[PDB]
Every structure is written in C-alpha cells, then in structure tokens.
Here is the input.
Amino acid sequence: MILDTDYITEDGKPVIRIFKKENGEFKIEYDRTFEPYFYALLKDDSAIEEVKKITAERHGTVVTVKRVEKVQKKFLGRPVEVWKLYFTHPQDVPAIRDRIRAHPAVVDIYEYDIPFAKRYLIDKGLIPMEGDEELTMLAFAIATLYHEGEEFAEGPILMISYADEEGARVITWKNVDLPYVDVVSTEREMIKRFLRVVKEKDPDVLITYNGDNFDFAYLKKRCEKLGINFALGRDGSEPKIQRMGDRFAVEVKGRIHFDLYPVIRRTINLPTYTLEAVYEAVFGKPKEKVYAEEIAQAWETGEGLERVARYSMEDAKVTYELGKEFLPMEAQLSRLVGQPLWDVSRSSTGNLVEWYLLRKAYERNELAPNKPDEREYERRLRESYAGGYVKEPEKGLWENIVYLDFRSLYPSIIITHNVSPDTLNREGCKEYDVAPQVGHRFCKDFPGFIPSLLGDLLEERQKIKRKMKATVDPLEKKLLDYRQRRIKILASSYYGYYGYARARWYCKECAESVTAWGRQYIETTIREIEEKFGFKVLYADTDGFFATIPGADAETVKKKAKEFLDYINAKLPGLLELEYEGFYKRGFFVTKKKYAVIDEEDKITTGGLEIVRRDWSEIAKETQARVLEALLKDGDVEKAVRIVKEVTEKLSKYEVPPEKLVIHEQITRDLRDYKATGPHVAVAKRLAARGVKIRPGTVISYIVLKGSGRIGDRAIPFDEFDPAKHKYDAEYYIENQVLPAVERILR
DNA sequence: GCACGTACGCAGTTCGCG
DNA sequence: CGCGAACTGCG
Ligand SMILES: Nc1ncnc2c1ncn2[C@@H]1OC[C@H](OP(=O)(O)OP(=O)(O)OP(=O)(O)O)[C@H]1O
Ligand SMILES: [Mg+2]
Here is the structure.
C-alpha cells in the first residue's frame, strides 16, 4: 500500500517521495516529473504575455513563471477557460500567488493553496491504505518527572515502555526487578536503547496516546537537549514536530505516528478522555492509574517503583490493544478520502470532506472553488438558517409509545432532490425540485456533485448496522456501533459542510433546503399519522417523533405503526423512508430535547437528560437514574422522594465519595478570548499560570469547595483534592445538583 | 502549505448588575 | 434577587 507522500528538493527541483510497503517490504519510490501549478482566470488571452513577466523574490531566488498552458475546465458544471501556470519549486506558489491575483487583467486564481505532496496524490489517482498488506504496529509510552514550576520537557524521562503483538516491555535507568523491566543506567541510553528497539523491530506504525502533545514531544525535546541522533525514521531522519495551529504533531518519515487521542475524540464521547477512561469504555475493564505524585515519590524513595513500571507497561499495553481495533477504522477513512493516514487521523470531519471533494473534482475536470477570505468567512459565520422541526412534548405519562424515525433524513434529502451547489438554480434544465418555504430550485437532469458521492456512505451504514444484529459478541457489537456512528457523522457533515464558513463548496441555500425539506416531511408525516390513522404525536425532534394511540393496547399500536410505515413510505420519493425504531411500554417527556421511556424488557432509555451530560456530577446522575427507575419501573413517587432525601443526608453528613462529586467541562476557546469567566474557566486559568497548557478541547475536572461567593472562586481541580484538607460544598451539590436534576419530575 | 476544525435548536447553569 | 448575557453539551 501507499503509506505517505512528501517531497525533497534536488537541485532546486521537487522530488516526490512515496513511502510504500509492497509485498511485505518497505520501499520508497521517487517521482521527479511532477511540476507545481495553479490556475488563473484572465479577461483577455492577450494578457498572458503580461502575466509571465510577473516575478517575485523568495530569499534571493527570483520566482518566475516556468510555463503556461491554456486548459478548458468546468466550474460547478459550466465550462470555463482558465490558464494553467507551471512553476519550478512548490514554494514558488506562495510567493507569487498574490502578485498574479492583483493583476488588473487576472480575474482570479484557483487551486493555489494545495500542498505539493497532497496534490500529487490527487492528480496521480493514488489512494493510500489500499492493498492486502498487513502493517506492523508498536505502541509506546513514556514516564516523566514533573515538578511545580519546571518548564515542560525540562525534567528527565523515568521510564520508556513499548508494546507490540509480542508483548510489552519497560526500559528504565533505575534497578527494578520485574521480568518485563529491562534496566540500563543512562536516560540517554534509555533513549538510545529505545532507538535500537524501534530500528530492530521496524514497525510500520507507532501508536501513542496524546504523543503529539506529550509523549513524542517530550522525547523530541530530550533529543535536542542531550544531543542525540534519534534516527527513528526509515530514511535515517529524526522525528519532526510539525505545527497545526495551536496544537502540534510529530512526524516520523517512513513510518506512521498513530496518535489515538484525536481518533478517540471523534469516535467516542466520554466525560473525560484519559487513557484509563478510554480503556474502560471500549473493552469494559477497569485500568488502574498511578498519579505523578506517586511516580515522583517512587523515584525518590526507591520503593514502589515496581507498581510504577506496571503502570507504564499497562500504558503501552492498552495503547496497542486500542490501536489494534481503531487503526482499521481509520484506514477505511483514509481509503475514502484518499489521503495519508497521518493527516486523516488528526483532521476534522470538515477537512476530510473537503479533501475528498477536491479529489473527485479533479476526476471530473471540475475547477475547485477557493476558500473564502477573512471577510466572506465572517459573513458566512454571521448568516444562518432555520434548523430542524421541534415540537413541545405532551406533558404527563403515556403508555404504548412507538418511535418512528427517518432513515438518514438529511443525507437522503440531498440525493433525492439533488441538493448541490452545481444544481442550485441551474438554467436550461428540464426537471426541477423546489425546496419548501426557502424556494431554492435544484436541477434534476444530471446527478449533482455531492449527491453523486453520498449514496455509497448511506449503504455502508446500513451494512454495518446489519452486522450489528448478526453479531453476538458484545465487543464486536460496540465496535460496529462506533463504525456506523462514524459514517453517520461523516455523511451528515456533508450537509454541515454547506454551512461551514471555511468550506470551499459553501452553499447556504443548499443547507436551507435540506432543513426545509426535513421540516416539511416530519410535519406532514405527523399530520398524516394523526388525521388518517388516529395516532397522537407526543414528541417530535427533526427526523423522528414519538406517537401512540391513546386508548389502544400495545398490540394495536404496534400493528397500526407498521401499517402507517408502508403507507407513508409508498408516498415518499426515492431514498426517503421512515423506520420503526423500537416500541416502549411507558414514557415521560419532561421538556424539549429531554425525555425518558421504558421498553418491554424494562430497559430505561433517556434522551437529553442530565444522566448523560459530563457537566453534571455522578451523584446527581445516580440520583436521577434511581428516580427514573422508581417512576418508570415501580411507579412509586414517594419512593423517589425518599431516595433524594437519603442522598442529601449523605451529602450533608459528608459521606459521599469525592469521585462521585466531579464536574467535567470542556475549554472550547483560548483562555484569553472568554467574555465571562466561569468555574471551569477560572480553574483552567489557574492551571495555565502553574505551567499546565490548557488548549482548546481540554476537559476541566473540578470540585466545588465549601465556601461563600462565586462557585469559580471555590472550585478546585480533582487532582489536588485531598479529603483530609479540603471539604466539598455539600450545600452546592444538594441545592444546585441533586435536587434540580430530579425536581423537574413534578407531575 | 493546509488544517483556522459540519450544521441548528435548546435546556440550563454561572455570573453580574440593579 | 429576577433577568440577561455568556457558556456547555446535548439531540
Ligand atoms: N452531528 C450531526 N451534524 C449534522 N447533522 C446531523 C448530525 N447528527 C444527526 N444529524 C441529522 O439529524 C437527523 C438525521 O439523522 P439520521 O436520520 O441520518 O440517522 P438515525 O437513523 O441515526 O436517526 P435518529 O437520531 O435515531 O432518529 C441527520 O441527518
Ligand atoms: Mg434519522
């Protein structure tokens, strides 16, 4: 397969490198025939003579137009006459792109901000991660000595553990008599020994957890400080820390650094994203953690280092086990977008969609729209459109509830009505599809750009969901659930891409249509099931709704539901279909987006309640869960009152564990761009002054202390919470946590 | 040479001023 | 001393 692609400079000309593992042997191919290029639109062909004269300087070397060739392409389906401008080195584009654009004759330039290595993959039709070639993996993690005030990566590395399919081992420079701990005295020698291990085993993939920000970055700093040649790559090169905005990423030429952190953050939604929490969510088994306070104590006292080695070994052990199950999922993702696994595992869903559209646009000789300037980006972010339909739920308890839901509503709407930028208000067509309310017209004579690509993703989701029923192993069922969720988010992102301010194929009118279509279908289906079939819709949210026949029994409501499904699906066009997504005995609808139902097997499923929100303490989630259990199962309202009263008694008496009193919250911005400072923002700003880097996406876990005033002023991180010194604000967790989450069931 | 991180709608908490 | 803005996370 094709692992990755980059380019070096030989005699001032770029040389594309293709890292590939063909027939079980590493190989690097060299292509020196690819030339940088980008298009330009001119008012008159006679101005091409005054365009080749435009020059620019790039550190002494003057940048000139190598060659020029007029090509005929298409822009959103209509033909266009553009001039292709060739260049010597890729870096010549960023130096002359702005000079060529501002020419009074040049209308606009196109495809000027495309990386060379990634332009080679699209133009040459090369697709990475394809081919029956198994990849050798090797996970590794490091243990560090951190002190309050010490700059990051300034302390020594205590242990360097690694794990592959052949077991897990730990390397340290302090005598530990454990069968898996190999002891060698120098930290440098530890690094150098780790260098021999990787070079000897020669893994194709290097799996880490947050290694781009800690494990591999810490190792790279010891490289430049201790003066070591960490030739870890297959070309004799050393790891390179690359910048991606605020975060950084480590690259190892010839190999693939698979950082599982960005992968898990896009696949699983957990309150906290620690390695011990991800292991519990995937494999369903607990993982013990050794904090830095105990690692620093074991290093100084010398006692207990065996347990520290057990933590480092387990760190690499679970990292390989998690990587062995999540790498194939990302390989499939890389095969769809057609980009290296390195870039795909660290890219957002919006970027993945754009990189796939850029490849398909080249396959169809379609000149790609260019990203918006800062002005248009701000203009797109300020504008919006009406979302989905939401109906105020009927209050009270209801019995014999059915949940009818549309099958991929928004994606199906795009394919059925050919909602795409190239088809929006296209003139000269024979058949059109008008969007409700919004009125946007879409050509249906030819398949749209986006609709022609969304069909396959929908089929894949129904295939994965089909194996979920045919799977008996719980581990394979959850892994398949992750795959179908990944396909749902990716497909739905195609819709969200229309509203993405940074999207090349930005189309608000396309996004307005998908919602207008969905709002019309759900509102008409609700009216049809009520007027014709006599159903009573209780709750409705976009693609689905909760309905029932008030006085009918369970057997009647279920049959009439399947009857209405065949009646409405026959009247629905194309891929538009409504599904029977489960029956429920009794249900409770608190408010909008928040409800709770119970099925035949007495399994209570909730939606939008505080039980699944990470910003609510577990003592509140546990109390709310037992209240729903006392109401939906037993139906004893007085029993729930005694439950919340028993919880408050334990809280006031300080009898609840501190682990059950943690509140997780995410830092979605930079600590400098926060208009208001909340509890989690105040704790983050305090950790930023202590050396901890609180970057966007960090989950803040704090505990409210017993005090008077602002909650943020009495908020302390969970790590520094000692029950001997600190005492939590029992009155806060009673009045502002346990009571409110359960008070909304007042009936 | 880039990634500037898919969309809207909404319940609900924290804070701050009156 | 209720309310509005800022903020998060859910569906
Ligand atoms: N993250 C998202 N971003 C944008 N649109 C989304 C997102 N999630 C869902 N949508 C839209 O929301 C509605 C619709 O979801 P399907 O019908 O595609 O998938 P089920 O079969 O799972 O439906 P159920 O939630 O179980 O009723 C999708 O277009
Ligand atoms: Mg749906």
Residues A 405-411, 488-489, 492, 495-496, 542-544, 581 surround 9O7 (ligand 1) (CB under 6 Å). The CA atoms of residues 39 and 84 of chain A lie 4 Å apart. Chain A has four domains: 2-123, 137-337, 390-608, 618-743. The longest strand of chain A covers residues 578-591.
